[PDB]
Amino acid sequence: KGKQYISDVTGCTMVDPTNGPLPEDNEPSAYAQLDCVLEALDRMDEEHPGLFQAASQNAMETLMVTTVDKLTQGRQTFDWTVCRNQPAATALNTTITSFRLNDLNGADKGGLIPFCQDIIDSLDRPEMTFFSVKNIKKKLPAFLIKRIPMKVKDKITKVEYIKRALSLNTMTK
Amino acid sequence: RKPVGQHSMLEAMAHRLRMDARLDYESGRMSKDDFEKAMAHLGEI
Amino acid sequence: MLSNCPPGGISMTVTGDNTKWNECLNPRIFLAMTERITRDSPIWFRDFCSIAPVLFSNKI
Amino acid sequence: MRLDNATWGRITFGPVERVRKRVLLNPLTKEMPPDEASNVIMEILFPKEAGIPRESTWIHRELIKEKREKLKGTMITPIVLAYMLERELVARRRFLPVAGATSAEFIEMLHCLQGENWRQIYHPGGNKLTESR
Amino acid sequence: MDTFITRNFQTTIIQKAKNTMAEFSEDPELQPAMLFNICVHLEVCYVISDMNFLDEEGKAYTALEGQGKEQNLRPQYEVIEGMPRTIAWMVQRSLAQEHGIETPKYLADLFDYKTKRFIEVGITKGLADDYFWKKKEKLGNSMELMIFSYNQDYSLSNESSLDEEGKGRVLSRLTELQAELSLKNLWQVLIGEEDVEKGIDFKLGQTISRLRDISVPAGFSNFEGMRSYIDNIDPKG
RNA sequence: AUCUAUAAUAGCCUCUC
RNA sequence: GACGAGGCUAUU
Numbered sequence: 272k273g274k275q276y277i278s279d280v281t282g283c284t285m286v287d288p289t290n291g292p293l294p295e296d297n298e299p300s301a302y303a304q305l306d307c308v309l310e311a312l313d314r315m316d317e318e319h320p321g322l323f324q325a326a327s328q329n330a331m332e333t334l335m336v337t338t339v340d341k342l343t344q345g346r347q348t349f350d351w352t353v354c355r356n357q358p359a360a361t362a363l364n365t366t367i368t369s370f371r372l373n374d375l376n377g378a379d380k381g382g383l384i385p386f387c388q389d390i391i392d393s394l395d396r397p398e399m400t401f402f403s404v405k406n407i408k409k410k411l412p413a414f415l416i417k418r419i420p421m422k423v424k425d426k427i428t429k430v431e432y433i434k435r436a437l438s439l440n441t442m443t444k
Numbered sequence: 445r446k447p448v449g450q451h452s453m454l455e456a457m458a459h460r461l462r463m464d465a466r467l468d469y470e471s472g473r474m475s476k477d478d479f480e481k482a483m484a485h486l487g488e489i
Numbered sequence: 490m491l492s493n494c495p496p497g498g499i500s501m502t503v504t505g506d507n508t509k510w511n512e513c514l515n516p517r518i519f520l521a522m523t524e525r526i527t528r529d530s531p532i533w534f535r536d537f538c539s540i541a542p543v544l545f546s547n548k549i
Numbered sequence: 550m551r552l553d554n555a556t557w558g559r560i561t562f563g564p565v566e567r568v569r570k571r572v573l574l575n576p577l578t579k580e581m582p583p584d585e586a587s588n589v590i591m592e593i594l595f596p597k598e599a600g601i602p603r604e605s606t607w608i609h610r611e612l613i614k615e616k617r618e619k620l621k622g623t624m625i626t627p628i629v630l631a632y633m634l635e636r637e638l639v640a641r642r643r644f645l646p647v648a649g650a651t652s653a654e655f656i657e658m659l660h661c662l663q664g665e666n667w668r669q670i671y672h673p674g675g676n677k678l679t680e681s682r
Numbered sequence: 683m684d685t686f687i688t689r690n691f692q693t694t695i696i697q698k699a700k701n702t703m704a705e706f707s708e709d710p711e712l713q714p715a716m717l718f719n720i721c722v723h724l725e726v727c728y729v730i731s732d733m734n735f736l737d738e739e740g741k742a743y744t745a746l747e748g749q750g751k752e753q754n755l756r757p758q759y760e761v762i763e764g765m766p767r768t769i770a771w772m773v774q775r776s777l778a779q780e781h782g783i784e785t786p787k788y789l790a791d792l793f794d795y796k797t798k799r800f801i802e803v804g805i806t807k808g809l810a811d812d813y814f815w816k817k818k819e820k821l822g823n824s825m826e827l828m829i830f831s832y833n834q835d836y837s838l839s840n841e842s843s844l845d846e847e848g849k850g851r852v853l854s855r856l857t858e859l860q861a862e863l864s865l866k867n868l869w870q871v872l873i874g875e876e877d878v879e880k881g882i883d884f885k886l887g888q889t890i891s892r893l894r895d896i897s898v899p900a901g902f903s904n905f906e907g908m909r910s911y912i913d914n915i916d917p918k919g
Numbered sequence: 920a921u922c923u924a925u926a927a928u929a930g931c932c933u934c935u936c
Numbered sequence: 937g938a939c940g941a942g943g944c945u946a947u948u
């Protein structure tokens with residue numbers, strides 16, 4: 272029951288329930304009201320003076336003293352270069368190398384902020400060159416199929432790269 | 445401790461090995477011939 | 490809360506779970522939350538904090 | 550050794566009200582926050598690649614020499630020695646339920662000290678600080 | 683502006699100066715003058731590092747033409763400046779550890795093996811003695827410092843460790859630099875004190891800007907309107 | 920009076936129908 | 937094919 276439109280960046284169908292009609296029953300509703308959320312946040316700010324400011328300042332300091340290697344601390348991470356799941360460190364290394372291929376050397380500065388600037392800029396590149404994995408299939412009689420992976424250069428367009436960056440890889444728990 | 449630096453690993457290693465070789469030479473740990481070999485390899489690199 | 494109960498009244502506790510917590514929460518509301526929280530911050534940090542809700546609003 | 554040179558008192562059965570407090574797990578002769586301990590360990594084991602001489606290490610300079618005396622000719626891998634030094638210097642503080650004995654010598658035996666319905670008198674071995682007394 | 687620096691100072695000098703300003707997080711273009719200073723400082727260091735060489739007897743001797751590369755094995759002085767902070771600190775700590783001298787609290791500019799001391803070379807625009815004393819205020823004797831000046835004024839530390847020829851050569855090089863920058867009309871370019879506040883930069887591109895624009899709640903055209911609404915409105919009631 | 924301070928990896932537990 | 941966060945634990 273929210274605003275449905277088409278994204279002009281990716282061409283995807285977008286649904287926006289915020290500020291939508293108020294519910295008329297007890298079914299789950301995503302139509303949050305911005306005014307009410309802001310009123311609740313202002314009440315929180317009034318009851319805890321300086322809390323938002325202190326939290327923002329501390330987060331800013333931590334970000335300014337945070338390096339690119341903080342991203343290796345994750346588990347299986349979606350890798351857009353292979354459109355697969357790879358260990359967080361492997362995915363970060365692959366992203367850094369691909370960015371190097373596309374004149375994006377922010378990760379060299381060391382901080383997380385320059386690397387995030389590089390990500391933002393990557394979203395604007397008309398094309399993307401990277402290293403991906405390609406498998407060769409061999410017929411081993413038993414017949415069975417044997418897979419030999421290897422690294423190969425690849426190129427994708429701006430919209431494809433943007434969709435890969437915004438992609439989530441889903442699995443079962 | 446996590447190493448820190450925006451320079452390449454090759455340059456850091458080269459400088460560290462240069463310093464180690466020179467200090468071994470000055471401390472007597474390395475002789476003339478080994479020092480000449482080490483300096484030649486470092487310069488070639 | 491037990492000591493703060495007005496005298497002669499009633500205090501009642503609701504054990505509650507929210508249904509469809511992740512399904513119904515919207516990244517746009519989170520963008521608004523981030524913008525409100527970082528009201529007195531430099532513009533660069535406000536943009537940086539707004540990036541993540543924006544990316545999640547366009548997630549695939 | 551602290552366990553071995555210890556005396557055990559009686560065991561009593563009765564209500565024991567316990568409060569959750571942030572307490573030290575293991576006794577340390579010298580304690581410093583993790584950053585100071587890391588700087589001291591880098592000084593002891595990797596003096597060459599230690600970087601800026603932070604002034605906070607001044608108080609511990611003498612200690613560093615002492616440690617460099619003991620490890621001059623050791624063939625143990627340096628990282629194991631570093632975590633040994635951390636084990637000796639860095640404190641581990643955790644929230645635990647306690648009832649009337651919060652010193653690390655007692656937190657070591659906490660599991661045997663008391664439950665919710667019983668108390669076990671325990672006299673740890675070693676020496677106790679005057680501040681605790 | 684930068685053409686003079688590129689032409690006069692070699693590629694290595696400019697590269698190391700730029701690396702140093704990156705280490706300190708100072709933009710070259712916004713603060714060109716500093717760049718130049720770094721270069722000249724680095725330059726003098728190399729000069730004072732290229733005038734002696736240790737021999738088999740551990741004594742200094744001068745250099746000249748006709749010498750083979752093999753004869754130059756270990757320089758008389760080791761250069762600290764012009765290197766990444768981590769590498770320079772490793773070098774200084776290694777020298778201190780292997781010469782039984784406590785590490786000075788601040789990074790040095792040079793190390794002399796003959797006297798086994800750390801030298802902090804400085805370049806001053808005003809009185810040489812005043813700069814010498816101000817540097818003395820930090821450590822004084824732990825790091826013997828020699829100061830040069832654009833007005834042919836030198837303040838060598840107590841333990842002289844160089845000859846008259848080298849000092850004269852350095853002063854003549856500085857004089858030539860002054861004359862060329864004067865006839866090229868760049869002294870005013872450097873004398874200017876123009877250092878405004880500089881902070882972190884995080885600029886949004888076109889794609890991310892559009893994504894944020896189409897990422898606002900219903901009832902807003904773009905993100906700027908949403909931000910203004912969040913900032914200015916009172917949601918009471 | 921533990922407030923501070925705190926590298927990395929891995930494990931266990933808790934937190935859509 | 938097995939994610940995020942919090943706590944605790946072990947190891948280097």
Ligand SMILES: [Mg+2]
Nearest residue numbers: 504505506507
């Ligand atoms: Mg519940």
